[PDB]
Amino acid sequence: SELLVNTKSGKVMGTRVPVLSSHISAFLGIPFAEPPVGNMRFRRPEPKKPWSGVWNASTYPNNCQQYVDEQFPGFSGSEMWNPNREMSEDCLYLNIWVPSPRPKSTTVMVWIYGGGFYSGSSTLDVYNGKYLAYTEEVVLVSLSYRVGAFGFLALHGSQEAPGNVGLLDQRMALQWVHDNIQFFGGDPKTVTIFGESAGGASVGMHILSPGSRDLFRRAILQSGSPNCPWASVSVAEGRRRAVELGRNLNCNLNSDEELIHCLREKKPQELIDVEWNVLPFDSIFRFSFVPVIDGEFFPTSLESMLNSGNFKKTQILLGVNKDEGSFFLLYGAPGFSKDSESKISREDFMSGVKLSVPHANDLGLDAVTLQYTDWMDDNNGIKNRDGLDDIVGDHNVICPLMHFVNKYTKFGNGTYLYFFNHRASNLVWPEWMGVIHGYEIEFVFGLPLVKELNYTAEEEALSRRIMHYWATFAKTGNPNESKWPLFTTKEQKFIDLNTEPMKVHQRLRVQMCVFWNQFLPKLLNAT
Amino acid sequence: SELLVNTKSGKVMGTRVPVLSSHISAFLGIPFAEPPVGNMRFRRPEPKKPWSGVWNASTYPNNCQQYVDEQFPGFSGSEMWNPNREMSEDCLYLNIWVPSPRPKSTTVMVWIYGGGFYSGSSTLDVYNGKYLAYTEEVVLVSLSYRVGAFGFLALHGSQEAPGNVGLLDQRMALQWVHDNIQFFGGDPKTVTIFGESAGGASVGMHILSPGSRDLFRRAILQSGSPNCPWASVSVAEGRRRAVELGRNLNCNLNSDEELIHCLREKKPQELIDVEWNVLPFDSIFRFSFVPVIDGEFFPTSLESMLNSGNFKKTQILLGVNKDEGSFFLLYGAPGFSKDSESKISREDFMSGVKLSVPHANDLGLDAVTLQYTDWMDDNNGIKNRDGLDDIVGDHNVICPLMHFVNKYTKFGNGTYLYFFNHRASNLVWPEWMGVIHGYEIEFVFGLPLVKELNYTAEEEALSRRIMHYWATFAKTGNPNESKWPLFTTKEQKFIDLNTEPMKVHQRLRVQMCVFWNQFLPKLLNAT
Ligand SMILES: CC[N+](C)(C)c1cccc(O)c1
Ligand SMILES: CC[N+](C)(C)c1cccc(O)c1
């Protein structure tokens, strides 16, 4: 049967799922590793020991333990990212969508979810890969990885809590995908890994890490990149933060071993409850447990790896959303309210800039303000609001990203850059947040095709355009079959991704990113 | 007779000069001090000992020794500022234009010429006050002061070369004007001193210096202010520079006395020939001998005097020209040519920024470039040219000026601000220099009235508008009799001075001046 697949790990019994007016095969909850429960907590992922009999892949697996967003109870706009399944340390599973009839050797797409590394689930409705698989005839895989302390606690030097295990979970699923995707009709030599924000940053990290380059062909980075200010921390900082977490749970802090045994004995929720109290600054767009520059997964500093072309050379497709910042301001910046226009005063604005650049000194904060302030209307509430959004966005997502493309393109084999600036008609978030972080996902996953979701006609088109772009690029290394220009260091071409007839632009936010990528860094170094 | 005037200094025989289709009285070359020749060189100005018999004031006096501009031989646009008379250390004279019939007690206007303190003459044709006097029925006085080493050499602590003597020459003429203007029909209690660039900066210095406040009523500052980066130097710098000048002439440098005797024995031209070799940096818009913050003429630092309201409180009328920088770039910046479009490359642009901010460090130079560069078209020759012009202008004239108005208005009694941005139709300078430094003078002195000068009809109007504004403000402390708004710290209103129907704007170049007045200063201090 089309639902019974044999794999090097065991037999898998999938399920037939309905798509639009047809069907596809669905293999959900396939284990790719040993449950990271018990003294395995914080440990590197273990390979799933093969099984006997058919594994039932007809229902989504559990979700990884993680901070749940209770900020707006019942508000779909926020709950849609919350885990829709029971949480559990036993969460290392992957899901595959397979076209019906099963392909003999088609292109594979692996999705790596986002969540600032502290959250994420492969089972969210927005990550339902049935539409992409059906529409673009691609084998769509969605993996899961330990998030929060569970996946990134880093007691560097220890083997019980090495750090980056969440990064290893991803890799192992990539390995599982490499090793068994042929049995699902997928071509293991044409596997494209794509992700958003933390997933988008993860992708580039696999591009960078030597132990991961050989396991995938092409990559798609959405609103995230390896060098994002919040995507990593030094071994020391990770240590610092690991200890602090221990401190918060009344743990013996005399040795890694005492510390780690302690943390291993505390309930998942116990680590989560105090997870944000370890950050080093009052700040926004900063997450507690993230990848560490350990010298293992990452041979060295990301910048030198970038600088010396020490990374897998291939084709990459990446982009950013118009308003990357809003989301984070509405959640931790004063003056912002989900239900108000959020006109921001200068006192509040200047507070926002302090939360945005936590590492900046007074001069740095002053340089940022000078640059993002209209001194001819410095008391405008709208201009201050928007100014804050651009700051959170440029510094955390768009500028870090432009640095990575510019550096990548130098040695890479084809760069394609998009700028998503279309606000879904049915968006439930206040208008002032604009084209919000993570709201390109639904277009990439072809949600606009399901009419009972009420998208506009041109949004359906947009979704098919992006889905094709995404699927066609994965298949060939080029989004084109009206041509989306190749990104080059000289011309710096890039395009818009909206319901209007695509347009080609140059030098994405140069002014602001020169400041963020070259000037500020220098200033703060000098001072 | 209307030409014979008795004064507390002696009888003066003037001359009748023709204006438009009528006449006026002219008293030119009246001595206000003892010739600063001999061992008097560098010494403070001495009062003119009274004379017997009638003094012949029918021909302009000599001009003060000074660097002559030979950059464009025969080019009127530059020679028009050159001395049109024989130069001589015997140059402390003043000129008065008196309406015919002589007024009984009318408003007096004293003009203090510009020239970056190294040049200037009261006898230039552009400074011919017959038009203003006739048209506005005002007693127009034009003084002269020692310029260059002769007027500003500063061996602070010495009495032979105290420094600022050029500033004292001005004062003494002001005193002479105070003491004898009544005999010419001028009201000594309604004397307005106005000047351009160095004269405009001089004016504000007399506003500041305690020993000068009582000698005038109102002030008009054109394209210059006391705190201009080039208007003053510390006693040390002046000393440093005085010695260096001595070094250049093979002078005993063992004592002020040996040094000064040496300099006193060298010919005027000898000091001039080496006058520019003492500057401390490769730079533009920097002059060798300028006022020194000596603690005598200036009680203390200009900023604290500004900060504590330690200055004469009255009404002031000041402004700037659209393109203050061009002139200085065309003369010392690479890439600029009087006869070319002057499209500037980035290599040349970056050289310009180095010459513009000589005291800036690498970070400072980088902050300036970031701010004045269009990184979306950083290779534009026109944009680089213009960018350089704005830099030389904002930092040397417009921003220093905005700081002085903002500080002044705080304790002042009426501020009126103009922005001259009209390029005379008959301008002989290349179009790219735009509305050039010092080209408002001719409008203020009503040159556009003499048809054989070929101005347009609306330029004639402009000139009468400004002349009235200038004369009406001096008479009443208000330019208005369509109303030129009063400058206030809150609103920051100011107007345009061009052939088009005046318009009111706010916050003159805020963006750029916040950077220049607040950010940069801080940056360079921090680093
Ligand atoms: C904005 C919603 N989404 C789940 C994508 C999310 C949440 C936290 C951090 C992120 O970078 C992104
Ligand atoms: C630009 C011509 N003018 C004589 C007014 C002049 C010359 C030198 C320095 C100045 O600030 C102004």
Swiss-Prot record, chains A, B:
Superkingdom to which the source organism belongs: Eukaryota
Ways its activity is controlled: Inhibited by substrate concentrations above 0.5 mM.
Effect of changing residue 196 to Q/D: reported as: Decrease in activity
BP-aspect Gene Ontology terms: acetylcholine catabolic process in synaptic cleft; choline metabolic process
- Provide the active-site residues from the annotation: 197 (acyl-ester intermediate), 324 (charge relay system), 437 (charge relay system)
The cross-references to Pfam families, in alphabetical order and at most eight, read: COesterase
May I have one GO cellular component term? side of membrane
Any S-S bridges, and between which cysteines? 64-91, 251-262, 399-513
Catalyses: acetylcholine + H2O = choline + acetate + H(+)
Please list the residues annotated as glycosylated: 56, 413, 454, 525
Which keywords, in A-to-Z order, does the entry hold? Cell membrane, Disulfide bond, Glycoprotein, GPI-anchor, Hydrolase, Lipoprotein, Membrane, Neurotransmitter degradation, Serine esterase, Signal, Synapse
Q: How is it modified after translation?
A: An interchain disulfide bond is present in what becomes position 593 of the T isoform.
**Hey, what tissues is this thing expressed in?**
Found in the synapses and to a lower extent in extrajunctional areas of muscle and nerve, and on erythrocyte membranes.
Mutating residue 196 to H leads to what result? Loss of activity
Q: Which GO terms describe its molecular function?
A: acetylcholinesterase activity
Q: How does it assemble?
A: Isoform H form is a homodimer; the asymmetric form is a disulfide-bonded oligomer composed of a collagenic subunit (Q) and a variable number of T catalytic subunits.
Name of the protein in its database record: Acetylcholinesterase
Annotated organism of origin:
Tetronarce californica (Pacific electric ray)
